From a paper:
Bromodomains (BRDs) are protein interaction modules that specifically recognize ε-N-lysine acetylation motifs, a key event in the reading process of epigenetic marks.
The most notable structural difference within the BRD core fold is a hairpin insertion located between helix αZ and the ZA loop that is present in all family VIII members. The nuclear body protein SP140 as well as the related protein LOC93349 and PCAF showed nonspecific binding to most peptides.
Author numbering: 176 to 291
Amino acid sequence: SMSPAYLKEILEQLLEAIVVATNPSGRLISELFQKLPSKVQYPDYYAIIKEPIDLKTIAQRIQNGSYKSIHAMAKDIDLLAKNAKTYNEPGSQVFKDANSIKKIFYMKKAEIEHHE
Ligand SMILES: [Cl-]
Ligand SMILES: [Cl-]
Ligand SMILES: [Zn+2]
Ligand SMILES: [Zn+2]
């Protein structure tokens, strides 16, 4: 049973891996995932997406100690990606970036959990 302090460091490392990741273009994969869209300008989004989430919210949850396991953060990352892949058309760059974020997260998780 790792301490809350140890868990936090792990979660921070996972988030960092996501937010520093770049595409071949050099663009940050995380760019369009930092902040949810305006409720005023994009009301359709909130009618369609039942549980909105963004990277800012996930970061806040890490700081709040809201997550009691790496799994809980992982489920939020899954949701982050699922929502983008629900509201946005497949093949789109946002769709691709959603998957890339998951790939980065789970690769980093494995690196951390399996290193010996
Ligand atoms: Cl495993
Ligand atoms: Cl494992
Ligand atoms: Zn394992
Ligand atoms: Zn090692």
